[PDB]
Structure 1
Amino acid sequence: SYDIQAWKKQCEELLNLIFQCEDSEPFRQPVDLLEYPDYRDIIDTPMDFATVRETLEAGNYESPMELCKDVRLIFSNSKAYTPSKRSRIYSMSLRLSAFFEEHISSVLSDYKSALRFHKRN
Structure 2
Amino acid sequence: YDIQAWKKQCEELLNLIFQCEDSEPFRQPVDLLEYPDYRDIIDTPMDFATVRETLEAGNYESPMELCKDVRLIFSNSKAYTPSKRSRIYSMSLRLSAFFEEHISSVLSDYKSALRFHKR
TM-score, normalised by the number of residues in structure 1: 0.98
1:2-61 CA-to-partner distances (Å, cap 9, x unmatched) read: 000000000000000000100000000000000101000000000000000000000000
How much does 1:107 deviate?
Answer: 0.1
Residue number in structure 2 paired with 1:20 = 19
Q: Please give the secondary structure, in 1, of the residue aligned with 2:44.
A: coil
Distance in 2 separating the partners of 1:12 and 1:26: 19
Gapped regions of structure 1 (runs ≥ 5): none
Identity of aligned residues (%): 100
Tell me the SS of whatever aligns to 2:70. Answer: helix
**What do you get for the CA RMSD once the two structures are aligned?**
0.2
Q: Tell me, which stretches of 5 or more residues in structure 2 are unaligned?
A: none
- Give structure 1 regions of 4+ aligned residues with deviation exceeding 3 angstroms: none
